[PDB]
Enzyme design. Structure first.
Site, mmCIF file in Angstrom:
data_model
loop_
_atom_site.group_PDB
_atom_site.id
_atom_site.type_symbol
_atom_site.label_atom_id
_atom_site.label_comp_id
_atom_site.label_asym_id
_atom_site.label_seq_id
_atom_site.Cartn_x
_atom_site.Cartn_y
_atom_site.Cartn_z
ATOM 1 N N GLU A 66 74.609 -28.382 -82.105
ATOM 2 C CA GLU A 66 73.869 -27.882 -83.224
ATOM 3 C C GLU A 66 72.471 -27.575 -82.923
ATOM 4 O OE1 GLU A 66 71.197 -29.224 -85.340
ATOM 5 O OE2 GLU A 66 70.890 -31.046 -83.970
ATOM 6 N N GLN A 318 72.662 -51.975 -101.138
ATOM 7 C CA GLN A 318 73.837 -51.175 -100.578
ATOM 8 C C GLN A 318 73.166 -50.157 -99.506
ATOM 9 O OE1 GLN A 318 75.818 -49.355 -103.914
ATOM 10 N NE2 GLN A 318 74.235 -47.461 -104.074
#
Length: 949
Positions: A66, A318
């Site tokens: 990329e 989380q």
């Protein structure tokens, strides 16, 4: 594959950006953004093929692709032509890499949509991958890994990546260095480029794109203009890379790590790999749990642990992962007894777990936080097209065309079975342990492969484990109470007869000085407030300034546990000491800033001290003091920069030594003597009246005189620190040796003048003309280093010019190439055409002229005037009116006497920062070393100050 079906989208009714979602049959998620009032249009493209589908032998292959996808089309086979074509019209593209997404994004000046996107579509048909781009981009990735050597968060990140299953693709190496990008393939004879064509052709072309375009044309014209322009995608139905397994497969669970850091920090890291709640986005218990873990409230765990002085800071919650699994991390700071009582800390964690099983799920918390996210999603002004679009393109893969707006800021149901379910997942069965300490010597053998940190497993015996399950009780724990900080103030005030675009001095005392403006553009119920608390005694010595710092720090820390709900509600603030005094900021909504601020003034007005809290903060900043011997030489250079270019400056050495005598009765005795007499100047901006602002100010100072009998200051003790005059032709330099780092630093400084209208445009134009040739030759071509900076110095009402370069070179050699760049610019003066002149000053004009995009942005600029007392509110149009009156010969005459090497007005000074063991050049004059900076400044004059506008 032109397919369209859509309707009205629930679009949070404050935005004006008109939307339409559609999915194309070739696997392209398409979102249409229509804002016909935007100056700059934008677009973004995500490919769900991530960095988890790489071949197992070459690391960071998609990264290098990329990078290399950028350069080279069959239409334009030149190397930088896409990138240079975006360098023409100020559009700054960037791209990034993730395990499950690869995302592309750019912008453009006004209308270059069709143009740049036609330069962008070709990338899929024909990328070129020539010799030179390849061989330089691998050097760019290796320099990125080289500058990412010392970033410790990625080291701990890779330590998560490496201490799982070494067979699972989570165990890959993300970026990939020189060694893995081009050392393993060519010794195996594998062409990297044929693998690139392999990767791109087989994987990319099929499906799973996620495009979004911010265009300003219409709903339909840009739509059949780009959807025509993107039909080139042809389906091959590449499957979605997901994992049917977790990477921590019971070999490294219930396990401990002992980490040796690079910085002197103390931390404990607890991690829970947890199942997927991406399908559970509807109720989304993890945001509620992240609210409940790191919560700070009455009877909370962290309130007690701060209250016991065991925990300096924490973070938990989380962590996102792959499609199959997700993570749950807990990262806390350590004190001295925090260092010794770690297992009991885990016990306190289990006490909070026992509290959570004890009270079970909660609903009123869920509706309350649901309403907070309701209001916050409800009232958004506008957005930055960069970063936002990359985020929503991250979730464009996962959400329907109506759920891409209402992304996570709305929750349908309550799932207590899910809460209990993940609560059952949070057990001593499931714990990963990582201990960070610099006291680990001779004991941690297992060294990192890429970076080289060292660790040891040394599994916890079973006694503590079984001790962890049975000993599950509660002590003095309470659930936190309902918030009261929710506003029903939603009424926008219509503008009065006092219609000004700049804040007026609505209140003047010998005690205070008050400037005020209400929100003309943004129309929000919110407000921003800025405050300086001026005092003479702030910079009289190191000792009391340290006492101020510790005072303000422990002070701010005191009400912080109360402050958590306000910042959790969207009410941000700042406390900060200065060399002059204290800095206060209040940002948020209009509800209770007077009330809360009243509580703030009473709190910092009337405050008490604990003894062991005092010892911890005293020792903690004491550790923060001798840390300052080890930092980056540019930060060190900016230290000496602001050191030398003020009137008085206290060094870190005498700051270290003077804290040996600091007692608490001495401190607490000095503070009300300190706080007896001071000045406040304030900027208030947002949804209010003038009279209510007068009442807030009145309130504050009334409270002040009420507690400490504050009387105003003398206008003879309203002082600033001055800036040093030079002997108008002299150049002095000295050196400082860095113990640790092998790199050398240098900084070169120019005292032009005060900020007159001519000198602003002189320095801005001269700054603009030296950006790109320095960018072209010094860092790129001469490959000196990465730290190469130049620019302004607005300080003490005096403008200035500085050059910041840190590289590993001989410094006089480095000087020689600096002067070589100066001669290069010298010839580049006479090489300017009229066109370069005109386009260059138009570039600087649009660089300078812009309406703001944030109320905080213009407030920081205005506040930057207020701290300099300038008030020249329309300096921009004034400077542009000057900017149109400028010649080439003007800057020649600016060069010859002031900037050239033959200069009677030469104000040049350099500073050397040594390393650990440290095409024409003329005869420079001899400088002298600076043994005593006071005796240096002993014969140097001082500047006047500015008549304020």
């Amino acid at each position: 594959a032109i397919k369209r079906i859509g309707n009205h989208i629930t679009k949070s009714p404050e935005d004006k950006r008109e939307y339409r979602g559609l999915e194309l049959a070739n696997g392209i998620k398409v979102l249409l953004i229509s804002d016909p009032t935007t100056d700059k249009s934008s677009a973004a493209l995500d490919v769900h093929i991530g960095s988890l589908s790489d071949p197992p032998n070459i690391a960071g292959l998609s990264h290098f692709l990329e990078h290399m996808l950028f350069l080279g089309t069959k239409k334009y086979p030149k190397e930088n032509e896409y990138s240079q074509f975006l360098s023409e019209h100020a559009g700054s593209s960037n791209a990034f890499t993730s395990g499950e997404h690869t995302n592309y994004y750019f912008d453009v000046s006004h209308e270059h949509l069709e143009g740049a996107l036609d330069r962008f579509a070709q990338f899929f048909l024909s990328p070129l991958f020539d010799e030179s781009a390849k061989d330089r981009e691998v050097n760019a990735v290796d320099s990125e890994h080289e500058k990412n050597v010392m970033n410790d968060a990625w080291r701990l990140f890779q330590l998560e990546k490496a201490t799982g299953n070494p067979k699972h693709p989570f165990s890959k190496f993300g970026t990939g260095n020189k060694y893995t990008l081009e050392t393993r393939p060519n010794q195996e004879g594998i062409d990297v480029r044929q693998e690139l064509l392999k990767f791109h052709s087989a994987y990319y072309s099929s499906n799973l794109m996620a495009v979004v375009v911010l265009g300003r044309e219409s709903l339909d014209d840009l739509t059949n203009l780009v959807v025509k322009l993107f039909s080139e995608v042809e389906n091959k139905n590449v499957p979605l890379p997901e994992f049917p397994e977790h990477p921590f497969q019971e070999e490294h669970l219930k396990q401990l790590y002992k980490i040796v850091p690079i910085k002197d920090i103390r931390n404990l890291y607890v991690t829970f790999p947890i199942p997927d709640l991406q399908k559970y986005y509807k109720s989304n218990p993890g945001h509620y749990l992240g609210h409940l873990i790191g919560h700070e409230g009455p009877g909370s765990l962290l309130s007690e642990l701060k209250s016991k002085g065991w925990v300096n800071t924490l973070v938990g919650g989380q962590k996102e992962g792959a499609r199959g699994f997700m993570f749950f991390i807990i990262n806390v700071d350590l004190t001295e007894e925090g260092l010794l009582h770690v297992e009991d800390i885990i016990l306190h964690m289990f006490q909070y777990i026992q509290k959570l099983r004890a009270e079970g799920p909660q609903e009123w918390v869920f509706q309350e936080l649901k309403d907070l996210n309701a209001v916050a999603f409800r009232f958004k002004d506008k957005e930055r097209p960069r970063g936002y679009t990359s985020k929503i393109a991250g979730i464009l893969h996962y959400y329907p065309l109506e759920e891409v707006l209402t992304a996570e800021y709305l929750l349908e149901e309550f799932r207590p079975d899910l809460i209990e379910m993940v609560l059952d997942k949070l057990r001593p069965e499931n714990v990963r342990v990582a201990i960070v300490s610099k006291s680990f010597e001779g004991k941690t053998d297992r060294t990192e492969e890429w970076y080289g940190t060292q660790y040891k497993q040394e599994a916890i015996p079973d006694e503590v484990i079984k001790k962890w399950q049975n000993a599950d009780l509660n002590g003095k724990f309470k659930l936190p109470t309902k918030n009261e900080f929710i506003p029903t103030n939603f009424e926008i005030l219509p503008l009065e007869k006092e219609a000004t675009p700049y804040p007026a001095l609505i209140k003047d005392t010998a005690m205070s000085k008050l400037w005020f403006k209400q929100d003309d553009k943004f129309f929000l119920p919110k407000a921003n407030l800025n405050f300086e608390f001026f005092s003479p005694f702030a910079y009289v010595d190191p000792l009391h300034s340290n006492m101020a710092y510790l005072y303000l720090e422990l002070l701010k820390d005191s009400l912080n546990e109360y402050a958590y709900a306000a910042e959790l509600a969207g009410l941000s603030y700042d406390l900060q000491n200065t060399i002059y005094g204290m800095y206060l900021s209040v940002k948020g909504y209009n509800d209770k800033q007077p009330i809360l601020l009243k509580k703030i003034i009473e709190k910092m007005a009337t405050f008490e001290i604990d003894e062991k809290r005092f010892e911890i903060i005293k020792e903690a900043y004491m550790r923060s003091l001798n840390n300052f011997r080890a930092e980056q030489p540019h930060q060190h250079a900016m230290y000496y920069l602001r050191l030398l270019m003020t009137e008085v400056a206290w060094t870190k050495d005498e700051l270290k030594e003077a804290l040996d005598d600091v007692t608490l009765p001495r401190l607490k005795a000095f503070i009300p003597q300190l706080l007896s007499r001071l000045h406040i100047e304030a900027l208030l901006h947002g949804n209010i009246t003038k009279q209510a602002a007068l009442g807030i100010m009145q309130m504050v100072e009334d409270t002040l005189i009420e507690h400490a009998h504050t009387k105003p200051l003398l206008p003879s003790q309203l002082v600033r620190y001055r800036e040093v005059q030079l002997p108008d032709r002299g150049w002095f330099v000295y050196q400082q040796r860095n113990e640790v780092h092998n790199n050398s630093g240098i900084e070169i400084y120019y005292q032009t003048d005060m900020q007159s209208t001519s000198e602003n445009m002189f320095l801005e134009l001269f700054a603009q003309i030296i950006s790109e040739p320095a960018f072209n030759t010094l860092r790129t071509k001469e490959q000196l280093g990465y730290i190469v900076f130049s620019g302004p110095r607005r300080a003490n009402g005096i403008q200035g010019l500085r050059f910041i370069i840190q590289s590993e070179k001989p410094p006089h050699y480095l000087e020689s190439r600096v002067e070589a760049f100066l001669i290069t610019m010298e010839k580049s003066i006479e090489d300017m055409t009229e066109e370069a002149f005109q386009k260059h000053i138009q570039a600087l004009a649009i660089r300078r002229l812009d309406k703001p995009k944030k109320l905080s942005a213009e407030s920081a600029k205005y506040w930057g005037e207020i701290i300099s007392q300038q008030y020249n509110f329309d300096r921009d149009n004034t400077e542009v009116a000057y900017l149109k009156t400028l010649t080439k010969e003007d800057i020649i005459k600016f060069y010859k006497e002031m900037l050239a090497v033959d200069a009677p007005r030469r104000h040049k000074v350099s500073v050397h920062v040594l390393a650990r063991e440290m095409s024409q050049a003329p005869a420079l004059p001899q400088p002298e070393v600076i043994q005593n900076m006071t005796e240096f400044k002993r014969g140097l004059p001082l500047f006047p100050l500015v008549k304020p506008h």
